[PDB]
C-alpha cells in the first residue's frame, strides 16, 4: 500500500494506490483506499482494510449526528478525534490502522490529521503511509511547495504514488486522486499504473533505467 495526503494553497491533495495483497498473492488491483466519509471529509486506508472501512464510515455516521445536533459542519479536528478516541479504547485488541483524516473548513482551512491504531493523532502538512511510503515521501519532499497550482499538486500526488507503485512490490494497480476544497472533495479519476508509467516515462524523461 501507498497512501499520501498533503496541504497546499488550493486545499488538500489525496492520492492512493489500489493494490491489495495476501502474502505474495495479489488479491485485488481495484481496491479503494480513499474512504468517502462524507462529501467534505476523506480518510485513507492503510493497515487493516476492514478496520479502516468499518470505523471510517462509522465516523461518517458520527459526523452526521454531530451536524444534526449542532446545526454546523463538524471540524476536521473534532472528526479526527472521534476516530482516534475510538481506536484508543480498542488499544491492545489488535486493530490495525494508519489513516489521514482530510478536510477543509472555514475555521481551520485545509487540515490533515494522521490517525493511528496506537492512538496517535498528528496534525500535519504532508503525510505518507504504507509499505511504499518512503518512495512517495522522496518525490513529495523534493517537489512540494505551498504555492503549487491545483493542476501541479494533483500531478505531484499522482507521480509520488507512481514512484512507490514502481519500486514497492506491494503497491500498484491504479492511482486514485482527490482534491479537497472548502465546498467539498472533488474526485480526479482512476489512473492505471501500467498505462501511467509509460506515459510518464516518455513525457517526463524519467525512469531511464527501465526499457520501454
Amino acid at each position: 500500500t501507498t497512501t499520501l495526503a498533503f496541504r497546499f494553497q488550493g486545499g488538500i491533495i489525496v492520492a492512493v494506490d489500489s493494490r491489495a495483497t495476501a502474502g505474495n498473492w495479489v488479491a485485488s488491483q481495484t481496491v479503494k483506499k480513499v474512504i468517502e466519509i462524507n462529501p467534505f471529509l476523506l480518510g485513507t486506508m492503510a493497515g487493516g482494510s476492514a478496520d479502516c472501512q468499518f470505523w471510517e464510515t462509522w465516523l461518517g455516521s458520527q459526523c452526521r449526528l454531530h451536524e444534526l445536533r449542532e446545526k454546523e459542519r463538524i471540524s476536521v479536528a473534532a472528526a479526527s478525534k472521534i476516530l482516534s478516541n475510538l481506536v484508543y479504547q480498542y488499544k491492545g485488541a489488535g486493530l490495525s490502522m494508519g489513516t489521514m483524516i482530510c478536510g477543509y473548513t472555514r475555521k481551520e482551512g485545509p487540515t490533515i490529521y494522521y490517525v493511528d491504531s496506537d492512538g496517535t493523532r498528528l496534525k500535519g502538512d504532508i503525510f505518507c503511509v504504507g509499505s511504499g511510503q518512503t518512495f512517495a515521501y522522496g518525490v513529495l519532499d523534493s517537489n512540494y511547495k505551498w504555492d503549487l497550482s491545483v493542476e501541479d499538486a494533483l500531478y505531484l500526488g499522482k507521480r509520488s504514488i507512481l514512484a512507490a507503485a514502481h519500486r514497492d512490490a506491494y503497491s500498484g494497480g491504479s492511482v486514485n486522486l482527490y482534491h479537497v476544497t472548502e465546498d467539498g472533495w472533488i474526485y480526479h479519476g482512476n489512473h492505471d499504473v501500467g498505462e501511467l508509467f509509460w506515459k510518464v516515462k516518455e513525457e517526463e524523461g524519467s525512469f531511464n533505467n527501465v526499457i520501454g
Binding site: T57, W58, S61, R64, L65, L68, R69
Partner: protein, 235 residues
C-alpha cells in the same frame, strides 16, 4: 396512590389519557402532505416580547428526508428526536440507504409505552413526522404517547387542533400544490392562533425529494403571509 401502568374501567391507560390533555394545552402544529412535498408549520407562542422567538425550535430535522414538528411539553421531545436521529443514521450505517418514514416513526413510537415502576411517565408531547422515501413517496405521520401512529393526508395537533382539523377536512384534496399547502397551513394557523400571525410567531417548513427537509426563513415566510392576505382580500 395507584400504579403508573394502571388501566381504567373503560380499558384505557390513565397516564396515556392524561398526557393527551397536556398535548391539548400545547401550541398548534399543522402538517399537510402533497404529491409535491409535505409542509410542516407551527405556532411559536412566545410567553413574552423579550423572548427571542427564533430560539423557539418546534420544527426539527431528523434526517435529510425526514422532518418533524412538535406540540405539548416540548422538553420531552428532545430525547425522542435524539432517538429518531440515531435510528435514521444507524439504519443508514447498517444498510447504506435512507430509512423508511414509517419505519422511523415506528422506532420513535416504540419508546412511548416504555414507562412504569424505563422512564417514570409517558411523553407529554405529540409529533408530526413528515418525510419522503422511494417506496411510499411523501408521507405525514402523527406519533402519540400511546405508541399509536396514524398516517395522514393532513393533520393538526395542539390547542387549536379540532377547529383546524375541521378546516383541513374541507380544504385538502389530492391535487394540492406545495404553494397551495404552504398558504393553507398559514391560513389555518392564523385562524386558531391567539396572537396575530406574522413571520416571528409562526414558522413554516417543508420536505421535498430534491432539496430535502428545509426550515423556512422569516423573510420567505413573510412573503407567503403577504401573499395570503392579498388572496383572501381578493374575494
Amino acid at each position: 396512590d395507584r400504579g403508573v401502568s394502571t388501566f381504567s374501567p373503560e380499558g384505557r391507560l390513565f397516564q396515556v389519557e392524561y398526557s393527551l390533555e397536556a398535548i391539548k394545552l400545547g401550541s398548534t402544529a399543522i402538517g399537510i402532505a402533497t404529491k409535491e412535498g409535505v409542509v410542516l408549520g407551527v405556532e411559536k407562542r412566545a410567553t413574552s416580547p423579550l423572548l427571542e422567538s427564533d430560539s423557539i425550535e418546534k420544527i426539527v430535522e431528523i434526517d435529510r428526508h425526514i422532518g418533524c414538528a412538535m406540540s405539548g411539553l416540548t422538553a420531552d421531545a428532545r430525547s425522542m428526536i435524539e432517538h429518531a436521529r440515531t435510528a435514521a443514521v444507524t439504519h443508514n450505517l447498517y444498510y447504506d440507504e435512507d430509512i423508511n418514514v414509517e419505519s422511523l416513526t415506528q422506532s420513535v413510537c416504540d419508546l412511548a409505552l416504555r414507562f412504569g415502576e424505563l422512564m417514570s411517565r409517558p411523553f407529554g408531547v405529540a409529533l408530526l413526522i413528515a418525510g419522503h422515501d422511494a417506496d411510499d413517496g411523501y408521507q405525514l405521520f402523527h406519533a402519540e404517547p400511546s405508541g399509536t401512529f396514524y398516517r395522514y393526508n393532513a393533520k393538526a395537533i395542539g390547542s387549536g387542533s379540532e377547529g383546524a382539523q375541521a378546516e383541513l377536512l374541507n380544504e385538502w384534496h389530492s391535487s394540492l400544490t406545495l404553494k397551495e399547502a404552504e398558504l393553507l397551513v398559514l391560513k389555518i394557523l392564523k385562524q386558531v392562533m391567539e396572537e396575530k400571525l406574522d413571520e416571528n410567531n409562526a414558522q413554516l417548513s417543508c420536505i421535498t425529494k430534491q432539496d430535502g427537509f428545509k426550515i423556512y426563513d422569516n423573510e420567505k415566510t413573510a412573503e407567503l403571509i403577504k401573499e395570503l392576505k392579498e388572496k383572501e382580500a381578493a374575494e
